Paper text:
Amongst the Arabidopsis MSL channels, MSL10 is enigmatic in that it has two separable functional modalities, regulated cell death signaling conferred by its N-terminal soluble ‘death’ domain and force-activated ion channel activity imparted by its C-terminal portion. When heterologously expressed in Xenopus oocytes, MSL10 is indeed activated by membrane stretch and displays a preference for anions. In Arabidopsis, MSL10 is primarily expressed in the shoot apex, root tips, and vascular tissues, playing a critical role in adaptation to hypo-osmotic shock and induction of programmed cell death. Analogous to DmMSL10/FLYC1, each subunit of the heptameric AtMSL10 channel is composed of a transmembrane domain (TMD) with six membrane-spanning helices (TM1-TM6) and a characteristic C-terminal cytoplasmic domain (CTD) shared by all MscS homologs.
We expressed the full-length wild-type AtMSL10 channel, consisting of 734 amino acids, in Pichia pastoris and purified the channel to homogeneity for single-particle cryo-EM analysis. The channel core, consisting of TM3-TM6 and the cytoplasmic C-terminal domain, was well resolved in the cryo-EM density map and allowed unambiguous placement of most of the side chains. However, the N-terminal ‘death’ domain (residues 1–165), part of the cytoplasmic domain between TM4 and TM5, including residues 335–386, 397–431, and 469–480, and the C-terminal end (residues 732–734), were not resolved in the reconstruction, and thus were absent in the final refined atomic model. AtMSL10 assembles as a symmetric heptamer in that the cryo-EM reconstructions without applied symmetry (C1 symmetry) and with imposed C7 symmetry are essentially identical. In contrast, reconstructions of AtMSL10 in C1 or C7 symmetry indicated that all CLDs adopt the ‘down’ configuration. To evaluate the conformational state of the wild-type AtMSL10 structure, we calculated the pore radius using program HOLE36. Strikingly, pore radius estimation indicated a wide-open central ion conduction path. In contrast, the wild-type DmMSL10/FLYC1 channel, which is the closest ortholog of AtMSL10, has a minimum radius of 3.5 Å at the equivalent hydrophobic gate. Thus, comparison of the ion-conduction pore dimensions of these channels indicates that the AtMSL10 structure likely represents an open conformation, which is remarkable because the wild-type AtMSL10 structure was determined in the absence of applied membrane tension that is required for channel activation. The open AtMSL10 structure was determined in detergent micelles that were essentially devoid of membrane lipids. Consistently, we did not observe lipid-like densities surrounding the channel.
Residue numbers in the entry:
A (entry chain A): 248 to 334, 387 to 396, 432 to 468, 481 to 731
B (entry chain B): 495 to 643
C (entry chain B): 693 to 731
Write the structure that this text describes.
């Protein structure tokens, strides 16, 4: 549509030029109005060109956001469509997009059949599709997680579109003001001295508003170019973890682990390093405990074996790979012990992370108690008088 | 090591491609404006207005362009690390992940993903384990003063 | 230190070895004695 209107207007301009190109001086007054009309036509042509470049910039930014998120958005949409069947166009579908779901899934599944009913899936989709898509409770939890992910994707799309809309509003404002001032200058309405006074006033306007414009440009470069996180991602800034809430071009809204709302200037964030749990691989855990220096090495080997068996017998929570080390020896009485193991998830699920860590710590405490590993204070020599 | 080398080559090529895209953009805009000026299409006053608007565009975008140029100078000229190298920044060890011209992605020892502005890294000192020689170890223990020599 | 896990495992092994060697030699640490006057 943009190129269509542009070519229409340029054809209008060239047609006007061809008709009046002939040297036919109807009247001196006619020449003045003809010059004014020509200047206005070329001014609106420049305005249309500015509109074209504006829409090109906005569309390339939208395409970058698409290459960033729309792939996962379409994947989630396809997964939701497949789940519903068992129980551009993609952009439009994404924009359009608990207990009840679990009850519906249970009703669909055959009574007294914990596993997913293959017959029901076969009647609704192909066997290969059902296998690719694939305990009723686990299926319900996965469906709830997929619904939450789709809601988060929709919120992220809305945030991106709102940021793009605000950027479009700002760019359109500057474009319109530039177009009107260009039309005024081409009409040649002001004298030289007044034009110089306007020039120095524009220089002062620049000197003043340019600091905030630089801040704004840095913020949008951080938001779009760097693009460190999406809406709903749990991120750490200056050592404190939060959750992304909004995507304003000049600020970002965060929720702390206590649900406290926070506001951060995007320019300030650009200077700081940013960490993202959602985009990170499976995260690592660490537990610290202390034991006496007199502990035999055999007990340490037994503890290592118990840790290994406990970690390998719980693959749904912990990866088999793990390490146990000694940090330092204090006064030849205390040994500092550290365990390292990786979850099957990231720190995005903070509550699940903490529950799993508590379970692992209690398990390690029980294993240490079983092995009779003890800690002791250094004996004190007292001389009476 | 071969996989890491391939990843490093891909990261370098992607950084070069982004740099090429940016340079091509500025080159194309400069070429079209040069063509317009040589065609002599605009009047003097409109040209002066365009000149002051370009001056304002410079005043605004030049801070970010300076940051970008510092970042690319740090990435290419200084070149302190490669992809997959384990480096220490501000006392914390990490692993290089990506080689963006304006940012670098790191993985901490807990596998946590981190983002650092390349301009900020340029100001800080950087340590690299991969490029370092065989490293030294140290162990501390305490004993009584009455211990015989 | 690129192989952080191997580095830490080797350091732990060395620390345990040093602990065993110190225990064999009967090298000990002691707190300073405290003088107490009853009333």
């Amino acid at each position: 549509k943009s190129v269509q209107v542009f070519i229409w207007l340029c054809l209008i301009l060239v047609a006007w030029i061809l008709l009046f190109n002939h040297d036919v001086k109807r009247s001196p007054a006619a020449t003045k109005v003809l010059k004014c009309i020509t200047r206005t036509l070329i001014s609106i042509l420049t305005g249309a060109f500015f509109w074209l470049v504006k829409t090109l910039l906005l569309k390339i930014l939208a395409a970058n956001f698409n290459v960033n998120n729309f792939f996962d958005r379409i994947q989630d949409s396809v997964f939701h469509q497949y789940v519903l069947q068992t129980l551009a166009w993609t952009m439009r579908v994404l924009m359009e997009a608990l207990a009840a779901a679990y009850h519906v899934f249970r009703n669909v599944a055959q009574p007294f059949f914990n596993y997913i009913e293959e017959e029901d899936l076969l009647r609704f989709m192909i066997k290969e599709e059902v296998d690719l898509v694939f305990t009723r409770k686990a299926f319900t939890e996965w469906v709830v997680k997929v619904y939450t992910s789709r809601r988060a994707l929709a919120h992220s799309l809305n945030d991106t579109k709102t940021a793009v809309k605000q950027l479009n509003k700002l760019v359109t404002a500057i474009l319109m003001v530039v177009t009107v001032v260009i039309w005024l200058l081409l009409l040649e309405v002001a004298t030289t001295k007044v034009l110089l006074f306007f020039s120095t006033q524009l220089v002062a306007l620049a000197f003043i508003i340019g600091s905030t414009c630089k801040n704004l440009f840095e913020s949008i470069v951080f938001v779009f170019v760097m693009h460190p996180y999406d809406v709903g991602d749990r991120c750490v800034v200056d050592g404190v973890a939060m959750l992304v809430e909004e995507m304003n071009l000049l600020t970002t809204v965060f929720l702390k682990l206590n649900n406290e709302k926070v506001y951060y200037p995007n320019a300030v964030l650009a200077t700081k390093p940013i960490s993202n749990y959602f985009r990170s691989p499976n995260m690592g855990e660490t537990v610290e405990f202390s034991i006496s220096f007199s502990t035999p090495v055999s007990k340490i080997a037994h503890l290592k074996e118990r840790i290994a068996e406990y970690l390998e017998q719980n693959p749904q929570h912990w990866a088999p790979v793990h390490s146990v080390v000694v940090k330092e020896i204090e006064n030849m009485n205390k040994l500092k012990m550290a365990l390292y193991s990786d979850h099957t998830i990231t720190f995005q699920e903070n509550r699940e992370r903490n529950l799993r860590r508590t379970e692992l710590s209690l398990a390690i405490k029980r294993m240490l108690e079983d092995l009779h590993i003890d800690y002791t204070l250094l004996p004190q020599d007292i001389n009476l008088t």
